[PDB]
């Protein structure tokens, strides 16, 4: 929290940069803390979060371009362009944060404006009562109606990050919007589980 909030007064002092580099390049988990940086007072740390978390998560991916965009709101988005060197032979993605439910559904088609290579992630401030069913139904109610993830350009998966962090990954393209297998997993760190090895099995989480 100190590293994240201290770089926001003025960035480019050549010590906050290395601190963010340490946070991205460290082995210790910091995902129990990152989702809580919605603003906390500042409204710029959003970008500072959105660029670190992804960087922290997408370790097996060759990330070549990060960009910070903002809508004419208090909605900052970060877009990413990356690729796999020697796996499934260019991907893109983006991440945005919202407040408690509604800014997500309100400007969903706008924040989307970053083969279905696009990967869209979203974080929402619901810091209460770890309850998979309620949050899952809340997000699924919107994904079951809004199919922009298929008809806009094609988005492989939509990740719902509840702020310790609870991850609900959905695919509103062909299948029912639910995933009991990759729940609570970061979709970029889903490879670091050796769970795809269970090829000959129908799994039940």
């Amino acid at each position: 929290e100190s590293i994240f909030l201290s770089a926001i007064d003025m960035y480019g002092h050549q010590f906050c940069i290395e601190n963010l580099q340490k946070l991205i390049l460290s082995e210790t988990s910091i995902f129990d803390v990152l989702p809580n940086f919605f603003y906390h007072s500042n409204q710029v740390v959003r970008m500072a979060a959105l660029e670190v978390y992804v960087r922290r998560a997408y370790i097996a991916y060759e990330l070549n371009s990060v960009q910070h965009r903002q809508l004419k709101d208090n909605t900052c988005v970060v877009e990413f362009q990356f690729m796999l060197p020697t796996s499934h032979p260019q991907r893109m993605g983006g991440m945005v944060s919202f407040r408690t439910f509604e800014d997500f559904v309100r400007i969903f088609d706008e924040v989307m404006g970053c083969e279905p290579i696009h990967i869209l992630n979203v974080a929402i401030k619901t810091d209460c009562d770890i309850e998979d069913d309620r949050l899952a139904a809340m997000f699924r109610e919107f994904t079951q109606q809004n199919k922009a993830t298929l008809v806009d350009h094609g988005i492989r998966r939509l990740t719902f990050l509840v702020a310790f962090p609870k991850f609900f990954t959905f695919r509103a393209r062909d299948k029912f919007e639910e995933d009991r297998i990759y729940r609570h997993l970061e979709p970029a760190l889903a490879f670091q589980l050796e769970l795809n090895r269970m090829r000959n099995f129908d799994l039940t989480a």
Partner: protein, 220 residues
């Protein structure tokens, strides 16, 4: 003019446009290897405009150019390469320290232009300075006239210098070993007409040694 210079120098897309202008005017006589490397680096920097963990890749362009130089291909690969890349070398040299370092260095150059004039009107009366300049510049009296002409409008120069110092060492409590030398020389302008530019300079020399309220707030 000062505010627009400040905002322009802080806009990350400026050296991108300088790169585009020097490279578009030179489409040939450059090896395709260094050209493609520069293209990829500037495309990355363009895709990462106005985002954290982003700086102009001057060092990477310098690296690929100096690598092709280290290979040192002979017989019209040496001379053509070393000549038709000097613009990009100058571009990375200007932005060797990033957009912020270039921003500070430009104002430093303006302040050095100020000192270039005013350091000749200290250490003596007016007539002593004029005589010394005539003795130093025997082969041309235009130089002495330029000196006197510049010194005539020293009050307007002082106003612009105050506006420059306001944006060079303001909300950034830190000073390098180059700004400090300019400020030291600028504070030694004992002549009262330049007191305005000395006094403010001393403020900087004492202002950039204070806490930013972030250390105390975070720790407490």
């Amino acid at each position: 003019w000062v505010e627009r210079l400040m905002k322009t120098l802080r806009d990350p897309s400026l050296p991108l446009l300088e790169l585009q202008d020097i490279m578009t005017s030179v489409s040939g006589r450059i090896p395709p290897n260094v050209e493609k490397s520069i293209k990829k680096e500037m495309a990355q920097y363009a895709s990462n405009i106005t985002s954290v963990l982003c700086q102009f890749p001057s060092q990477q362009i310098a690296n690929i150019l100096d690598s092709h130089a280290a290979t040192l291909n002979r017989k019209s690969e040496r001379e053509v390469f070393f000549m038709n890349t000097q613009s990009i070398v100058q571009l990375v040299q200007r932005y060797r320290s990033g957009i912020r370092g270039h921003m500070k260095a430009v104002v430093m150059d303006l302040l050095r232009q100020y000192l270039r004039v005013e350091t000749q009107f200290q250490n003596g009366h007016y007539d002593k300075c004029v005589f010394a300049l005539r003795e130093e510049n025997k082969s041309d009296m235009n130089t002495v006239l330029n000196y006197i002409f510049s010194h005539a409008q020293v009050t307007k120069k002082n106003l612009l210098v105050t506006m420059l110092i306001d944006q060079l060492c303001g909300r950034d409590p830190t000073l390098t070993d180059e700004l400090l030398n300019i400020l030291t020389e600028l504070t030694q302008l004992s002549k009262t007409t330049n007191a305005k530019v000395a006094l403010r300079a001393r403020q900087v020399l004492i202002a950039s040694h204070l806490p930013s309220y972030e250390l105390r707030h975070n720790q407490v």
